[PDB]
């Protein structure tokens, strides 16, 4: 045989990692460099933009770290976009730009800074950075918390970044991870970036599946056909969406209805029950043994 590794001794010496690390959600190496503030700042919050793209949604939050836990000043989710006209495709790059733009304008509107710091209303895709206006409240500033996402060129977390800076957030960044930075020649053409922002890269893919195979097209886009969003009206849909966001970024929570107060989960068994089951298991094991005897 072979010696057992996971024995009594193994667990006596085992030191678990942090809960968020055992679950695989937080990189505490990068978090230590992100959240903590210089000691000569004294409770000056260090805001950071949290972008987490999931399978069916895009979550953009802005938080600053406190001792008891991060505090979210405002958040914008992708599942709100149907209000502003973006019916389907709530996780593509063009949707990420909207969620970032929504988060920006929603934050500024809670600071009375929406009139100032408009940003880029006419989206171009170039290297834009808002600078503070003298005599006015300083422009808001945060940093991007990519999390565990591999940050290569064209990652959707940078789409929300572009949406935020065009909304009026002073986020330090470089125009190198945007979709449009040609790697072998080291330049950036804002035009192709403007394509991904207005969702043109997927529009042609619907057009590509037009003459190639329509049945496979119906299989790759079903709710696009269900919501009647053809590649024709996609670019204007986002422009209508952006304008609808900048004019009403306020969020109205859903009305909270009182619920019947039931329990779907299984309550934890008590000691008396746990201790009595053993008496039944042993007794039944005997009263089944003399039946064989």
């Amino acid at each position: 045989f072979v010696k057992v590794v996971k024995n009594k001794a193994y667990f006596k010496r085992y030191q678990v990692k942090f809960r968020r690390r055992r679950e695989g959600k937080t990189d505490y190496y990068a978090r230590k460099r992100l959240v903590i503030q210089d000691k000569n700042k004294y409770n000056t919050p260090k805001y950071r933009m949290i972008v987490r793209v999931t399978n069916r949604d895009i979550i953009c939050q802005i938080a600053y770290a406190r001792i008891e836990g991060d505090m979210i000043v405002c958040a914008a989710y992708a599942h709100e976009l149907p209000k502003y006209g973006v019916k389907v495709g709530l996780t593509n790059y063009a949707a990420a730009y909207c969620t970032g733009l929504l988060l920006a304008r929603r934050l500024l509107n809670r600071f009375g800074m929406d009139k100032i710091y408009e940003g880029q209303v006419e989206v171009t895709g170039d290297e834009y950075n808002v600078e503070s206006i003298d005599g006015q409240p300083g422009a808001f500033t945060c940093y991007l918390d990519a999390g565990l996402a591999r940050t290569t060129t064209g990652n959707k977390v940078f789409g929300a970044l572009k949406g935020a800076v065009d909304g009026g957030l002073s986020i330090p960044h470089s125009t190198k991870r945007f979709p449009g930075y040609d790697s072998e020649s080291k330049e950036f053409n804002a035009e192709v970036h403007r394509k991904h922002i207005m969702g043109q890269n997927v529009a042609d893919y619907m057009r590509y599946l037009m003459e190639e195979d329509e049945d496979a097209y119906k299989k790759q886009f079903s709710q696009y056909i269900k919501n009647n969003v053809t590649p024709d009206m996609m670019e204007e849909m986002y422009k209508k969406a952006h304008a609808a966001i900048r004019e009403n970024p306020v969020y109205e929570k859903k009305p909270k209805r009182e619920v019947k107060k039931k329990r779907w989960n299984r309550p934890k068994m008590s000691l008396a029950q746990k201790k009595d089951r053993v008496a039944q298991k042993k007794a039944s094991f005997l009263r089944a043994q003399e039946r064989a005897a």
């Binding site: 978090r31 000691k39 000569n40």
Partner: protein, 159 residues
């Protein structure tokens, strides 16, 4: 004679506690330190930058200067029949807020509370702490039972 190495004899002093190695909990970093804060020093081996010298591990001082990552502390070090209030720059990880001063700060509140209170009532309420006094005279009830007898048990060779 011994060597004069900086980390000499700190095999256990700077070691991490059992099953407490690994990354540093971030609450230590997000902890503010004003000037004049009473602070106790405790070197942590996980972070080798800005460690205090071993003659300050366990000592308590007060902050006088705050930089980006570290603080300046004024600690009393006894050097052959004279005390020296000397300044050290230690990085935050080796630092805790001293809870020795707070129990005084807490006691100041009730003193300032029970002074403005019971002033208009006139009742003179004791403020100074007093040592544990000799306990009062009381009655011990033996209702029912009578005190059971104790007698030394006999010896019997254990081994």
């Amino acid at each position: 004679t011994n060597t004069k190495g900086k980390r000499r004899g700190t095999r256990y002093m700077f070691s991490r506690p059992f099953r407490k190695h690994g990354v540093v909990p971030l609450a230590t970093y997000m902890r503010i330190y004003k000037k004049g804060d009473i602070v106790d020093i405790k070197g942590m081996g996980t972070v080798q930058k800005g460690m205090p010298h071993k003659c300050y591990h366990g000592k308590t001082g007060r902050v006088y200067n705050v930089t980006q990552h570290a603080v300046g502390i004024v600690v009393n070090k006894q050097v052959k029949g004279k005390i020296l209030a000397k300044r050290i720059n230690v990085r935050i990880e080796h630092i805790k807020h001293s809870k020795s001063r707070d129990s005084f700060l807490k006691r100041v509140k009730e003193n300032d509370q029970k002074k403005k209170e019971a002033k208009e009532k006139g009742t003179w309420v004791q403020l100074k702490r007093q040592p544990a006094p000799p306990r009062e005279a009381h009655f011990v009830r033996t209702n029912g039972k009578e005190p059971e007898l104790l007698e030394p048990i006999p010896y019997e060779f254990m081994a």
